[PDB]
Amino acid sequence: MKVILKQDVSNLGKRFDVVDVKDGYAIHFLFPKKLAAPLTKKSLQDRDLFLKKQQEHYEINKALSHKLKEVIEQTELHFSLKEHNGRPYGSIITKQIINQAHTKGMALQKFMFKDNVRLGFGDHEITLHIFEDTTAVLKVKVTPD
Amino acid sequence: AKKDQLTLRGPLYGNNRSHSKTITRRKWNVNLQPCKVKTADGKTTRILVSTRTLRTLKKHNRL
């Protein structure tokens, strides 16, 4: 399947290495949260290149994650309940965060924001991890009609 | 056409038995796998691919 990962030790093996062990299909390569890039460079310099890219990419991920929590905490998320006799029917799912993201325009993925499938009424708050160097909080409010 | 688009491999018509004095014919249906494809623009979802082609994609890291 794959011989490379996008991340170092997170919960098991298969680090950001030129060669990594594998046991069948995995999200170790499928998820955009943790992928692999084509090797296409491996004579001797590839391992140093991957190591240096690992440190640099971790640092830049941390910087952009700080900016993204700031920008997403500043903004507000509001929707409307199309309700009958005060009974909530509106769907509150990853759709909404994807909509508000595409209005803002940052690259995400729908399995990356894992959000509980349920309904909601009134103001409520959610705590979620975006990447493995991240911990964020987002707010949702709704108006009745 | 029971085959993928990126590679052209036609199902071969052959024979079948473990025991007989006569001869018969059957085909070999090439195994086809619906998998997401990878490109920088647009369409990236289900396309049918061959298993050996899949394995080549895995070692070539075509995502």
Added chain:
RNA sequence: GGUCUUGUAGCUCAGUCGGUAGAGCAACGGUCUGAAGAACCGUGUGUCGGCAGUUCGAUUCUGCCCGAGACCACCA
């Protein structure tokens, strides 16, 4: 051809690993009983398929044979 299993009494079932041949029916005698019953105790039927080894000492162990029930044999 191998790979497993099966053999006991006049018939139908037993079977402590080696430390032994045993119920029911087939035939008779007897016991209980006012009588006929009835039921039951039992004379008997036993080299435990056969052949060479094992064991103080073999029906079951080892090897062979005999009577048998099961899964396997075809070039394109």
Added chain:
RNA sequence: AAGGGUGCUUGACUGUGAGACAUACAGGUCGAACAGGUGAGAAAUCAGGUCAUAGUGAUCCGGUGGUCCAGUAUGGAAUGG
């Protein structure tokens, strides 16, 4: 006597066989005799299964023993003869 019995050994040998029998063929039958080593019996000679006429199953193919035979360029090996 080719019957019976006793003793002795084990030719119910090997390489062969002109010459014949009858013969669609294949196939089947009788053996003269030579050379080698033989056993019986002093020798003589016998002994190339049962006194005979019945007692059988073609080839490929496969296996077994030997194999002075070959062995794919070579040596071996495989493999076949």
Added chain:
RNA sequence: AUCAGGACAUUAUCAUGUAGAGAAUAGGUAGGAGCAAUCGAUGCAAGUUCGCUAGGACUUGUUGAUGCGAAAGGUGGAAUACUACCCUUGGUUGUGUGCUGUUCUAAUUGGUAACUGUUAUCCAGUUUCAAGACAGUGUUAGGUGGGCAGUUUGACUGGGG
């Protein structure tokens, strides 16, 4: 991805065992005629296993430096401890080999629903709803399978049967 549970190996683990006579539960083979002896014996208490209600073994208490009556004398066809061995049953963890039941989603499947393209029940996508690594499907190898194909089904003969 995921945890758990059951099997086959065996370390190491202890127990393991009746014909009669045998003071005898005796599985036997042969060197040993020994050693337990502050680590301490004949013999007794509570517990575990056990099988003969009777055999054997272990922790603590106790006996106090002796004896094991099964070292040798002594008995038994088969002798006593230990020594190495082949049998044992059960459990205990050590992992290897594949098995079953788990959860998740993330591959995959949708003849769930919705939306846009699109005046449209097909489709493309996105989500949902689900299942869910089952299972469609491919390959390999078994079974079943006159639904079906190919055919087969000697001869002599007062005709043939």
Added chain:
RNA sequence: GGACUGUUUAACUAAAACACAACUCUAUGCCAAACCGUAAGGUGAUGUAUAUGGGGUGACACCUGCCCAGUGCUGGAAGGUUAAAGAAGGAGGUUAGCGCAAGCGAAGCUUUUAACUGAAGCCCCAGUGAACGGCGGCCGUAACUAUAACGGUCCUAAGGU
């Protein structure tokens, strides 16, 4: 004889035949189950067990007696049979070299089928007859006796109510 209305070889047979009401069993909870098709696709069906096709019988009324021996079925696991494959281990050969001949022999590879596991089916068992299919002889016995209720035996799963 069949209930009947009704159907069938245009052109040698119209009915004891077909068919229906109705009866019975059976596979099926939906993407069904049955299939038609090489797959998409389609009916049953914009269907939903009073549905759905198949197997048998064929007004109405009454009965459905025995036998799971074997066949086909349902369920199960004690044990054995079991391909494919996974892989304990062994063997063969070459020979760098050791090497007096021989022979041995590291090295990679070839040839080798194995130790073990290994599905279902099969052998096995429990059930299953408005599912296949079958539903035996003999012997004597009741005050003339031919009669055999009544009893006994060989076979088998079973001996025709």
Added chain:
RNA sequence: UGGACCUAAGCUGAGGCUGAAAAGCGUAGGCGAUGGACAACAGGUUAAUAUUCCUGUACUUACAGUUAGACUGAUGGAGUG
């Protein structure tokens, strides 16, 4: 009578789906009366047709100027048929 209207199963079929090829299936579309809608009858005459040809009596749907009244209103929804 039939087209310039639409449909009945059915056919075809941009895309599309499936399948060695051929091809099959199928979306939107488009065809298909023997259906549904629309305004003419009496008579005369050639040897040959006639409601069409000729006499009469009409109607019809569209375009164009025009006068009088008036804001209308579709591929959209509903009845209708």
Added chain:
RNA sequence: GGAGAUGGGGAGCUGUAGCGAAAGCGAGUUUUAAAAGAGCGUUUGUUUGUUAUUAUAGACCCGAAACGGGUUGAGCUAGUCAUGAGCAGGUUGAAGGUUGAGUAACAUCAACUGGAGGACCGAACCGACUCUCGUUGAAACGAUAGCGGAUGACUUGUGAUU
């Protein structure tokens, strides 16, 4: 090369020694210990044409019931979807409801309207059950005579489909 004979063109081809399984030999070879015996040997042409036979080719010749592949077919027949239409005429009176009698009221009864049939009688219409006729005809399926069904599993006009 006048789409001719030929010239060129040894590449091969028969013989020149054979044996055997071959190794290997050889006027020997195989058997074996053997030279014995047995086995074939102990030089015995070739290139043509012409006949005869033959080898395989549709091969002395005409004869099938078939087989597989590929096309054609629903204007016949059978089945179905749509669209229609017709079925002379006459009988028959199931209910239901209503009136009255009856009864405590029912039940029951006398009736009136009313019209139900895989109803009936039976034309066109369908079918072809029966005898005669022709049966190398008027006619490759009828003609006369009868017969059954004939408001429903009836028929057929047309389209379509298998």
Added chain:
RNA sequence: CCUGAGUAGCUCGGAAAACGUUAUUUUGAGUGAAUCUGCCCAGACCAUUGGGUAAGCCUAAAUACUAAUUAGUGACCGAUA
């Protein structure tokens, strides 16, 4: 430093090679290396030797045939051919 990787191989089926699957060519499933220092081959497979570097591309002749155009020939048939 480079000389063409799911590639040579190998297992399971297969197919063309005279071959009726065996080295040699192709591959449907599966699995899986090396780099001229090596790889393969010389019909199993090792050693020695040789042969040349497949896993890139194209390439006129050497040909089969006459529907045509023209000329011509026929030990070709002469209207049942």
Added chain:
RNA sequence: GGGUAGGUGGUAAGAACCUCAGAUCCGGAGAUUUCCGAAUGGAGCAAUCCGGUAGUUGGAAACAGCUAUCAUUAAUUGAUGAAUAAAUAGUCAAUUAAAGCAAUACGUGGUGAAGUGAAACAUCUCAGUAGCCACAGGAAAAGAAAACGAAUGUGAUUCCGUGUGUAGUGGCGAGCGAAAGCGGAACAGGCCAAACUUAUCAUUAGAUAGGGGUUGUAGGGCUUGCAAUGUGGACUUGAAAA
């Protein structure tokens, strides 16, 4: 252009014409060329109906006359665009090639059985044959060494003849059947990628554009050096000549 004294295609008699200023006739270049038919604006029963656009002429208009255009796919270009900002499918416009048919013959590839003999037949054969399909061109396929094959030996591929009906192969039958070797027809081998080097791409380029480079007796890359304007077409032009 050539050539001519008549002709008005065949059934030939008549008409009525032109012709000696060159017809008729022959060849070359041509113009035009109804409908349907790949048939393609749309449909349908081929020789049928309805069209749309842009013009243009008549008439108040309606409508009528003469022209071109309007089908699909694929590729390229521009606009275009939903969930969802972008992107994305899609939508339209523009340019370019079809798609057909046949030379009933030859080419390849894919599909793909029987009766047939074997005195049966299921093997082998009939054969990859028939037939079908798709793509072809005047031809195609094939084709430059993991070629051979045993040698002190050859040196792209195809065909012809010997080898030879051999070695082999096979219900070891029917049969099938070479490959080398030799003798001829012709004989041209060249071209990428890969090492490295010049720029763009967020220099994570892994892509493009260019230079070097096109393998056995190894070659190329690398720092250099020496020598040379060469011969070839498989081919671009025009010019001449035949």
